[PDB]
Amino acid sequence: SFTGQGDFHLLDHRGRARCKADFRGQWVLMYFGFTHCPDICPDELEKLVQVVRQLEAEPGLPPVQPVFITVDPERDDVEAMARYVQDFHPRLLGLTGSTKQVAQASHSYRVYYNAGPKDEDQDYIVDHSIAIYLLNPDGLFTDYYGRSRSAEQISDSVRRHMAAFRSVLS
Numbered sequence: 001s002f003t004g005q006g007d008f009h010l011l012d013h014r015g016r017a018r019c020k021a022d023f024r025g026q027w028v029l030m031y032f033g034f035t036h037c038p039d040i041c042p043d044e045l046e047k048l049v050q051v052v053r054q055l056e057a058e059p060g061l062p063p064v065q066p067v068f069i070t071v072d073p074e075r076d077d078v079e080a081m082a083r084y085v086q087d088f089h090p091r092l093l094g095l096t097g098s099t100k101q102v103a104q105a106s107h108s109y110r111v112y113y114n115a116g117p118k119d120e121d122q123d124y125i126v127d128h129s130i131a132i133y134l135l136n137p138d139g140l141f142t143d144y145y146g147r148s149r150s151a152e153q154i155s156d157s158v159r160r161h162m163a164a165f166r167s168v169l170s
C-alpha cells in the first residue's frame with residue numbers, strides 16, 4: 001500500500017522546486033556537473049546541444065530535453081543556474097539542491113563521483129567522470145552514455161537506444 005514512485009526533488013533555475021512526476025511524458029538527458037568546469041562541460045554541453053538540434057531537424061526522433069545537475073552546493077546558486085541555462089540557450093534546464101537531497105538520491109541510485117582528502121598545499125575539487133543517462137516517459141531510466149564520444153556517435157546511439165526501448169504504438 002502507497003506510492004512513493006522512487007521519487008526525487010530538485011530546485012528549478014527560476015526559484016521553484018520540481019518533483020519526479022512533472023518530467024513524465026518526455027525523453028530527458030541527465031547530466032552531472034557543476035557551475036565552474038573549465039574545459040569539459042563547454043565542449044560536451046555544446047556537443048550535446050548540436051545533437052538536440054539535430055533531433056529538432058530529424059522527424060520522428062525523441063524530444064530529448066537536457067537537465068544539468070550540481071554535484072556539490074558549496075560553490076553554486078539558483079541565480080548562477082539561471083545564467084548558466086540562458087547564456088547557453090533557454091532550451092537548457094538547471095537543477096540544484098543540498099546534502100540530504102544529493103546523498104539520499106546517491107544512496108537510492110549508486111553512481112560515481114570522487115570526494116577527496118587534502119592537507120597542506122593544495123589543489124583538487126571533485127572528479128565528475130563525464131557519464132550521462134537517459135530518463136524516459138514513465139519516470140524510469142533506459143541506459144547510459146558519455147566517457148568519450150562526439151556528435152556522430154551520439155545521434156546513431158540515440159537512434160539505437162530508441163530502437164531498443166521502442167515505440168509501441170509500433
Ligand SMILES: [Cu+]
Pocket residue numbers: 033037038039040041042128
Ligand atoms: Cu565538466
